[PDB]
């Protein structure tokens, strides 16, 4: 087995390089990792948390589970990261979601795509969980419709590709549930709504949660491989950071 | 070293794709038949990556076939320092590809079998490995 992953990682590091060159020559479609299964096999997602999670992070993890139709929540009690990724790769999962917190406040969200990446890390701001809503009720778990707004750059398209395939392909035309990721100065606003088509328009009601997610790291490998080559990273101490936009 | 046999393989692949170039492009058999060739060469390991037809015309070479040879492959895997030496163990019967040992140097390993190559369990060559690492476990007989 260890000869599998070593050989396939070398093939992947090459394939991304060829894809990068081909795109640059085109500068002068769906990404390789997702091209094989794009719209063929419905994604398989595991959502987990850091060691010894607080009650809220467990609640927030449950909310993220409800967001993705094919997500399953897994307790991270003493699990070792190589064991976690290896065990999940055995089960055939497509993506792994790991959540971090600070005093019961969700701070981060990391997404790793199996079997060979990429890994995207995000920071959560202004998080509002549905447990802050009284008499909210239960969610609808149909396949959502997806709305992506203001993703223009190549990195923006990359973030679109990662987020698109967390959901099932081919939602029904009349599904009442819509999930939106709106980019505004690299701070992607995530909202969930249920709509009804009226005789003179459409009215929408949000289900929650609200949270703003900003990319700060994107590596070519699973989240375990700390040595994985970095495809893109956010620079903050640059003098132009206060006004620079990437997505 | 004589490469007449592989040279026959390379050309025979070239003649096949050429005559397929002669058939009408829209013929389903032509498109079907080609895809079997691209798959077969990929399976053998002659093609490191999936390719198109004109790529088969030039990618296929004697060196690609020789790279797939078991004497060559264990050298890349660092099992043997030298190729003639590598030919010795396989002729000395200390090498297994999958559940079957191969005593013939001329065997090339396919992409899928490329990795299951290893020593036979009771090979004295393997004991010298684990003895230095001091990980020799007599229960595994190795």
């Amino acid at each position: 087995m260890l000869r599998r992953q070593a050989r396939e990682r070398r093939e992947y590091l090459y394939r991304k390089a060829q894809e990068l060159q081909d795109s640059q020559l085109q500068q002068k479609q769906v990404d390789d990792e997702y091209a094989a299964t794009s719209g063929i096999m419905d994604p398989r997602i595991i959502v987990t948390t850091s060691r010894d999670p607080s009650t809220r992070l467990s609640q927030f993890a449950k909310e993220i589970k409800l967001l993705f139709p094919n997500a399953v929540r897994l307790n991270r009690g003493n699990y070792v990261m190589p064991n976690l990724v290896d065990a999940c790769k055995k089960s055939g999962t497509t993506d792994l979601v790991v959540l971090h917190e600070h005093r019961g406040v969700p701070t981060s969200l990391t997404i790793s795509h199996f079997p060979h990446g990429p890994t995207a890390q995000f920071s959560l701001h202004n998080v509002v969980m549905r447990h802050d809503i009284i008499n909210a009720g239960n969610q609808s778990e149909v396949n959502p419709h997806l709305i992506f707004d203001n993703f223009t750059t190549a990195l923006g398209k990359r973030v679109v590709c990662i987020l698109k395939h967390l959901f099932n392909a081919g939602p029904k035309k009349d599904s009442e549930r819509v999930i939106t990721f709106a980019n505004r100065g690299d701070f992607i606003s995530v909202r969930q709504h249920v709509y009804v088509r009226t005789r003179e328009g459409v009215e929408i009601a949000e289900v929650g949660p609200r949270f703003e997610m900003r990319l700060f790291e994107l590596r070519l490998g699973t989240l375990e491989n700390k040595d994985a080559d970095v495809e893109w990273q956010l620079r903050r101490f640059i003098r132009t950071a206060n006004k620079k936009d990437y997505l | 070293e004589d490469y007449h046999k592989y040279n026959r393989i390379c050309g025979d692949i070239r003649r096949l794709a050429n005559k397929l170039s002669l058939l009408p492009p829209t013929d389903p058999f032509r498109r079907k038949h080609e895809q079997l060739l691209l798959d077969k060469l990929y399976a053998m390991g002659v093609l490191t990556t999936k390719s198109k037809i004109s790529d088969l015309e030039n990618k296929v070479t004697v060196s690609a076939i020789c790279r797939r040879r078991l004497p060559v492959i264990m050298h890349r895997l660092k099992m043997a320092e030298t190729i003639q030496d590598a030919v010795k163990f396989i002729e000395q019967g200390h090498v297994r590809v999958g559940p079957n040992l191969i005593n013939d140097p001329a065997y090339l390993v396919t992409r899928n079998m490329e990795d299951y190559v290893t020593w036979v369990d009771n090979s004295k060559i393997k004991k010298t490995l684990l003895r230095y690492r001091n990980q020799i476990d007599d229960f595994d007989f190795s």
């Binding site: 040595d227 | 895997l77 660092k78 099992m79 290893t118 020593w119 393997k126 010298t128 490995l129």
Partner: peptide
Amino acid sequence: LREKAKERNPDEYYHAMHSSMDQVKLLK
């Protein structure tokens, strides 16, 4: 070095594998 440690075939073989204070210095 880490990748070399990570991607080490355990099965690899090489043929090298088979192979008064002052008074103490004079004695040895």
